[PDB]
Design a protein around this ligand. Structure first.
Ligand SMILES: *[C@@H]1CC(=O)N(CC)C1=O
Ligand SMILES: *[C@@H]1CC(=O)N(CC)C1=O
Lengths: 306, 306
């Protein structure tokens, strides 16, 4: 028993981080097979970032202007190309530590682990969710750009995020591994608006099921509700609307606990209108929305990986 | 910016987990050099655990009764011995992946990362603190015994915890790597009392400094206090008393932020007496006590590891 915000084991990703330098800018790259992936703003100076013309900046760079370092191992760049907002550096050495892997573009509300790196070296690992406004609430200092987010499926690493930017509000934005930003953001140092950060309802419900499984039952009430009535209350509290797909994904948790999804929704509704009244749930005094239904099942069943 | 409950990267430990079987009991072992470490209750059946006589049970075991598996790699046991509550199995193969390492016995309030494993395979990693009553609030299912807790110092892994038991209250107990339990607990399935779980005050203060560094300043008040006056209030709320050693360890955070430790103590005192009033700090509605002062510095400065 017990319930923790658990990250994936990071060993398979640790072996893929390198340091990429171009001019005086140093960040992190991801070395898979014979390609290194990194943010294209490695070719920018601090002044360039206010209004960069990436095509024009990239024209004055040759293969030998990119220094890629894996420990004290020097990789030779034999080709480079820009794909959307990432640079692909072809090197002469395939990474012997290349895990089995796949690039995935995730949806808001999904969760992943971030391996925070500086100078190609791992600093720590934590779990987070892609917010509905396409930001993440990370922990990133200068130099962390190119750190990656990932999930593990048995022996397979799914890379879903590469860190690019901190917004002036203190939240973080980045791309998938094809270089397409999540959200409306661009790799320019300019004021950029994020939208409303709503709460991920299907994740809150999953975490309430985790609570019941672990013995926290006080919030279970006498009421039920309908999906329209719940969604009417949810939207007033800046909660994401629940759909039938969400009800379907929660089915295994409803079966294991004997609590109908709509019954759990009526419990959540009372919590939104009456608050927690100084109570806690799974050691939190706020409703937690960074566990997906699959996260809960994984942690409550003991799934392992390569 | 941003602040996250960050675990250490787990790659160096992943390479040291094996599966240990004896009879019908399977758990995890830690393979370092040519020794495997595991909980001695691997030699117990489920009935033995009610009242085990370990010396007597161990007499009916020979080297070949212990099966140790690292992937599909079979290790040969050439010697075994009991040291306190851990078994030391000497195998014929040194682990080629042995990191540089050291066994440490930690103090309550210190933090470490746990690599939760099942059948010798990593499941996830999370950060936690040794509670003042010598339990940890972990996430562990059956089969997780022998999972280890650790810290990293550059290239050096410090192993500090091995999981042994879940108490009937749902909290977790274990040993250092010399087999000595943390706390008054024994490896017997019997009702065992844990004492009061107090809040780790010096960690709460460190996290308040992290908040100020990251822009959460609302709780900073007009008052100051003394260490005796604060400790008088702290003890009423089941907070650990603060000592001068604690003030000393917080010195670098006081210097960076310009806020005297005793001033921060008076802010904490008002929070204890008046509550948060629906406010949050670093996204939490409770005072968080699982960051040490060193954790805060590490995360706010970007320390990295091998
Ligand atoms: C992991 C290895 C890989 O490429 N795949 C393809 C679908 C995986 O699931
Ligand atoms: C890491 C490697 C090791 O054995 N030590 C000794 C003090 C470390 O700090």
């Amino acid at each position: 028993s017990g319930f923790r915000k658990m990250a994936f084991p990071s060993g398979k990703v640790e072996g893929c981080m390198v340091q990429v330098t171009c001019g005086t800018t140093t960040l992190n790259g991801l070395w898979l097979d014979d390609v290194v992936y990194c943010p294209r703003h490695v070719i920018c100076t601090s002044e360039d970032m206010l209004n960069p013309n990436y095509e024009d900046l990239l024209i004055r760079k040759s293969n030998h202007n990119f220094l890629v370092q894996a420990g004290n191992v020097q990789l030779r760049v034999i080709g480079h190309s820009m794909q959307n907002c990432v640079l692909k550096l072809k090197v002469d050495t395939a990474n012997p530590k290349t895990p089995k892997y796949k690039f995935v573009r995730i949806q808001p509300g999904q969760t992943f682990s971030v391996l925070a790196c500086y100078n190609g070296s791992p600093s720590g690992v934590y779990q987070c969710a892609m917010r509905p406004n396409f930001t993440i609430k990370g922990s990133f200092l200068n130099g962390s750009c190119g750190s990656v987010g990932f999930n593990i499926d048995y022996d397979c690493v799914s890379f879903c995020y590469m860190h690019h930017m901190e917004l002036p509000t203190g939240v973080h934005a980045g791309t998938d591994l094809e270089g397409n930003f999540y959200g409306p953001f661009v790799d320019r140092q300019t004021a950029q608006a994020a939208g409303t950060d709503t709460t991920i309802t299907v994740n809150v419900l999953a975490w309430l099921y985790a609570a019941v499984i672990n013995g926290d039952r006080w919030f279970l009430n006498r009421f039920t509700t309908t999906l329209n009535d719940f969604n009417l209350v949810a939207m007033k509290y800046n909660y994401e609307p629940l759909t039938q797909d969400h009800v379907d994904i929660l089915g295994p948790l409803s079966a294991q606990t004997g609590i109908a999804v709509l019954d759990m929704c009526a419990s959540l509704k009372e919590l939104l209108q009456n608050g927690m009244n100084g109570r806690t749930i799974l050691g939190s005094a706020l409703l937690e929305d960074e566990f997906t239904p699959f996260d809960v099942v994984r942690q409550c069943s003991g799934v392992t990986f390569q």
